[PDB]
Amino acid sequence: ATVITTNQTGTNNGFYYSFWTDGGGSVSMTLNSGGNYSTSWTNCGNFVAGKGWSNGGRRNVQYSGSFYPSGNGYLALYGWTSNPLVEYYIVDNWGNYRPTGTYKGTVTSDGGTYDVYQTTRYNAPSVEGTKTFNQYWSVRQSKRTGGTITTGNHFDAWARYGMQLGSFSYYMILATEGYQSSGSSNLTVSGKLA
Ligand SMILES: [Cl-]
Ligand SMILES: [Cl-]
Ligand SMILES: [Cl-]
Ligand SMILES: [Cl-]
Ligand SMILES: [Cl-]
Ligand SMILES: [Cl-]
Ligand SMILES: [Cl-]
Structure with missing residues (x-):
């Protein structure tokens, strides 16, 4: 496991990852085996973190796990062009x-x-x-x-x-x-x- 608390991009166990925060509250991402990542946040400003691919494209994404927001959060396939x-x-x-x-x-x-x-x-x-x-x-x-x-x-x-x-x-x-x-x-x- 690798704990991430600072704006970076990287690779982890075959997967691209990305973490961004504006600095608010307490926000962490934990990168585990293969496609797995966890996040924990307390009174954030704004953050986005996840695993996927260095490059978008037309793929069929499979995912599972849990997503428990208290107030405003999103679960999304996400990227840029x-x-x-x-x-x-x-x-x-x-x-x-x-x-x-x-x-x-x-x-x-x-x-x-x-x-x-x-x-x-x-x-x-x-x-x-x-x-x-x-x-x-x-x-x-x-x-x-x-x-x-x-x-x-x-x-x-x-x-x-x-x-x-x-x-x-x-x-x-x-x-x-x-x-x-x-x-x-x-x-x-x-x-x-x-
Ligand atoms: Cl809160
Ligand atoms: Cl489905
Ligand atoms: Cl759910
Ligand atoms: Cl909810
Ligand atoms: Cl409209
Ligand atoms: Cl619903
Ligand atoms: Cl629906």
């Missing part, structure tokens, strides 16, 4: 706050119905430092922790709705995210290109 710069989310679980923006329609994937949203952040933290970028959201209509996310279904449906992804230059991870909250996650990821 360049040219253009996009932060993207496929959200399977959340706490008291459901992500929302400009509604674009639905996509059905992996046994669920996902609402598609677009929002924008101005002069915000990014993989390319302080930047302005669009966020693409798929948000399941019902909470679950575990199953397959077929990324191709989400990418194809965003594309049909005017949401163009750039290049998969950046990581794609199964993320735990927290805003002004506390909780834990314990998640195992694997997957493969479709």
Whole structure:
């Protein structure tokens, strides 16, 4: 096991990982065997941490484990693109706050119905430092922790709705995210290109 408490990216037991925090409260990630990682957070500001891949792409992600937010947290397949710069989310679980923006329609994937949203952040933290970028959201209509996310279904449906992804230059991870909250996650990821 390797405990992570500081903004870094890395590799661990075959998997890319990523941890980001704005410094608030107490936040840790523990990297275990294969696809497994745990997080623990107490009164965070904002953090994102997970395991996956150095590069996004159309794969079938399998994951399992537990996700217990007290207040605002997300469980999401998460990453970035360049040219253009996009932060993207496929959200399977959340706490008291459901992500929302400009509604674009639905996509059905992996046994669920996902609402598609677009929002924008101005002069915000990014993989390319302080930047302005669009966020693409798929948000399941019902909470679950575990199953397959077929990324191709989400990418194809965003594309049909005017949401163009750039290049998969950046990581794609199964993320735990927290805003002004506390909780834990314990998640195992694997997957493969479709
Ligand atoms: Cl909850
Ligand atoms: Cl709307
Ligand atoms: Cl659903
Ligand atoms: Cl639900
Ligand atoms: Cl759950
Ligand atoms: Cl599934
Ligand atoms: Cl809290």
